[PDB]
A = this chain, B = another copy of it.
Amino acid sequence: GYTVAVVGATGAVGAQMIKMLEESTLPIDKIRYLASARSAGKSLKFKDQDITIEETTETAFEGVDIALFSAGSSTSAKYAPYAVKAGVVVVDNTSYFRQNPDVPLVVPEVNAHALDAHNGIIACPNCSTIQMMVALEPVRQKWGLDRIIVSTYQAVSGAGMGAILETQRELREVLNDGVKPCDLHAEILPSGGDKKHYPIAFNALPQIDVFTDNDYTYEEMKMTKETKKIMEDDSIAVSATCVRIPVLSAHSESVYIETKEVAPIEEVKAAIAAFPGAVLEDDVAHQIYPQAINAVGSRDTFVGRIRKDLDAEKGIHMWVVSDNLLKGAAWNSVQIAETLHERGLVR
């Protein structure tokens, strides 16, 4: 079997990477947990075994077959090249390598073939992108995609363990102490890397990541650019609004598309139901639609509220929900690793 390293083992995604690896079909002979110097020497479980956390260094990857990076774009930029030079296959959860033309950007149900071209690094897309691609690829295949407009409803776990804890504390202050939401102290959200921090409790923050020069955020632009690369079609117009809401896990998305050919709604529903990784949950007569609280803990992407636009012949609206730490991150990464093993690409 393989020696597998999890870089960022101690964080929100890393905890789920451990769970997904424990549950994986990858033959794992040895597991290593890497994080920063401040976590080094502590212990975490792999199944019933205690694993000592190691500091991530330029020389830490000797003997490793597969390294799953989920420690921030900075850590991947710094250490992933050293891992690759040591002969490790890197699956990177971060944004750093995603737009590199020599790096496959993969959702296995959509573009697993792109893995065949890897040169030691495979990038996992952003969580919001991944779930949208699972919902939309079956439609693209049959009727084409001309454009996408999406508004997201993103859970705080996407911003890390600290953001989860900040959200819980803020909510308790309002509910238990009677603090007005606008009076709350915040330190992390909307973006740890930006200058000002705002409460998320009882709020909706229209900022994920930092702003780019075109006044879309980096998160919005990641959805645009990653979609084009994954679907291998720069002609698909994509514009996004990405919003943080007071949900701990599971992202929801209000997705509008226009197809190239008119796609009958009942056929769209069937095509989505038929697509691996997508689950149709759509029966409005019984108030059945995807819900964040029900999606948590599942690797599936759930799609419903599917309906024609009221005016645009080729327009369709839908609602897409998935656990942002599973299909949006740790499960997509472990699924990549399993696909590399299955296809003889761990080399």
Q: Which residues of A contact B (CB under 8 A)?
A: 147, 149, 151, 153, 168, 171-172, 175-176, 180-182, 190, 194-196, 198-199, 201-207, 211, 214-216, 224, 237-239, 241, 243, 245-248, 252, 254, 256, 284-287, 289-294, 296, 304-305, 307, 309-312, 315, 317, 319, 321
Contacts and interface: CB of A to CB of B under 8 A. Distances in A.
A149 to B, nearest CB: 6
A289 B224 contact: no
B237 A293 contact: no
Contacts of A287: 190, 194-196, 198, 207, 211
Nearest to A224: B310
20 contacts: A149-B256, A149-B309, A151-B254, A172-B176, A190-B287, A202-B248, A202-B293, A203-B292, A204-B291, A204-B321, A205-B291, A206-B305, A211-B287, A215-B284, A215-B305, A237-B311, A238-B310, A239-B312, A246-B246, A254-B254
Contacts of A207: 287, 289
Given A181-B293, A201-B293, A206-B290, 13 more contacts: A153-B245, A171-B175, A182-B293, A194-B287, A195-B286, A206-B252, A214-B307, A216-B310, A237-B312, A238-B310, A239-B312, A239-B317, A246-B246
Contacts of A202: 246-248, 292-293
Nearest to A238: B310
Given A175-B175, A293-B182, A239 B205 contact: no
5 closest A-B pairs (Cβ-Cβ)? A237-B311, A151-B254, A151-B151, A181-B293, A215-B307
Copies held by the complex: 2
A168 B172 CA distance: 11
A60 to B, nearest CB: 37
Contacts of A211: 284-285, 287
A309 B147 CA distance: 11
A328 to B, nearest CB: 15
Contacts of A315: 239
Given A247-B204, A287-B190, A241 B293 contact: no
Contact of A311 (B147, B198, B305): B147
Contacts of A312: 147, 237, 239
Contact of A245 (B246, B290, B321): B246
A47 to B, nearest CB: 24
Nearest to A211: B284
B204 A245 contact: yes
Contacts of A294: 182
